[PDB]
Amino acid sequence: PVSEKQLAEVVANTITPLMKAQSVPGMAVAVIYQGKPHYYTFGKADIAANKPVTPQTLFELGSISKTFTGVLGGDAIARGEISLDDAVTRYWPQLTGKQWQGIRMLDLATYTAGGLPLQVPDEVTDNASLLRFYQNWQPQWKPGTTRLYANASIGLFGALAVKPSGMPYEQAMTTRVLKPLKLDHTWINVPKAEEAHYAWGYRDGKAVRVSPGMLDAQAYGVKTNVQDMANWVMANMAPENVADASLKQGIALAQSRYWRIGSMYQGLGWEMLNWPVEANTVVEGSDSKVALAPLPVAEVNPPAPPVKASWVHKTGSTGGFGSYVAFIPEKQIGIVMLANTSYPNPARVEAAYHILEAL
Ligand SMILES: *C(=O)[C@H](CC)[C@H]1NC(C(=O)O)=C2[C@H]1CCC[C@H]2OCCCC
């Protein structure tokens, strides 16, 4: 058993060098090991005001928000309000274009709909334009044949996953996910009384923050501190300890394997690789050329339930932040790395892989 001291050094001697080389002003880390999380804070949350990163510091999660969208979706499935097999059209009858027919809620949740673009275009400001956008979309591939990572796919899935509930996305997430897990410092919209905890992002010397856009709460809009995030990782890492029954199942469903893409497996928001896995295959699958490419898929039908020996992770960014989380259920270890600079993902996973490998 690694002492608290050794682990502190291990995190120290990995993150500082990582912050120097990538000139990251601030980052907070945890470190889930032996039932408890362990926090480490470095640098600044705001250079201009010289406020150091604290365990209360709020960070933009970026694409890591998709993991919440994934679990919230699984929760609706657990309650029976929705089914992955249903036609997307079943929750958006207005979507009449014949090209949507054999497309499922599953395809949306897993970027397998046939080439939905990485982003929902900027001309899309309201409901009428969201409709027109999707209504005009012409698929490059048949459903369930190609994985093309997109915010416009999963963004839609989350907004449609909550319709039967009659609850707006923000309200459904706080009620069914955030509140039952005691994540009271995680928000889709930071309340005025917490702005003070809100860190500033840092693009090339410039202080920045995410902007509002359609289907954002679902794909890249969530903010939290390292404590809430560590508990969000503890819940996803050990759902047995989750009392709420539907939420317990929603978590398992998000970690379930729906498609094999080379060495990777696609869940609801989460992505997985069998453990043991070498750092080289996780670091290289992390490169833009791989992560943005539309790759041929292999259906895991029926969906494989959570496999403990999995390296389960998710990377996320906004203009000014960079975050990464990874956990191995079989070994009850996990890591949260929140930084206020969007550095390269391959650099995030190597550092994460390095500290976990020590545990
Ligand atoms: C998840 O981290 C996102 C989703 C919004 C990643 N996808 C893209 C994109 O669709 O362009 C990103 C990237 C994170 C960084 C933000 C965004 O890049 C746009 C450029 C503005 C920084």
Backbone angles phi, psi at 192, to 5 degrees: -45, -40
User: Beta-strand (E) ranges in 135-228?
Assistant: 146-147, 186-187, 201-203, 206-208, 223-224
69 labelled as ligand-binding? no
Q: Which residues contact 188 (CB under 8 A, 6 or more apart)?
A: 169, 170, 173, 217, 221, 222, 223
Dmax over CA atoms of the chain, in Å, equals 61
Domain 1-359, CATH among 3.40.710.10, 3.40.50.300, 3.10.129.10, 3.40.30.10? 3.40.710.10
Quote the CA–CA distance of 278 and 143 in Å, as a whole number: 32
Quote the CA–CA distance of 270 and 186 in Å, as a whole number: 18
**Rg of the chain over CA atoms, in angstroms?**
19
Q: Where are the domains of the chain?
A: 1-359
223 labelled as ligand-binding? no
Atom 16 of ligand 1: nearest residue by CA position:
318
Q: Find the distance separating the first CA and the last CA of the chain, reported in whole Å.
A: 8
Distance 6 CA to ligand 1 centre (A): 35
Q: Which of 21, 47, 44, 42 is nearest to 30 (CA)?
A: 42
Residue 323 · residue 347 · CB < 8 Å: no
314 labelled as ligand-binding? yes
- How was this structure obtained? X-ray
Query: Between β-strands 206-208 and 201-203, what pairing exists: parallel, antiparallel or unpaired?
Result: antiparallel
Resolution for this PDB entry, in angstroms: 2.2
Quote the CA–CA distance of 214 and 249 in Å, as a whole number: 28
Q: Does the annotation mark 149 as catalytic?
A: yes
Structure tokens at 257: 């394997």
Quote the CA–CA distance of 296 and 283 in Å, as a whole number: 20
Q: Is the dihedral of CA 359, 226, 220, 182 positive or negative?
A: positive
Spot the catalytic one: 134, 149, 265, 343. Answer: 149
Distance 202 CA to ligand 1 centre (A): 14
Residue 20 CB neighbour total at 10 angstroms: 9
Quote the CA–CA distance of 85 and 102 in Å, as a whole number: 10
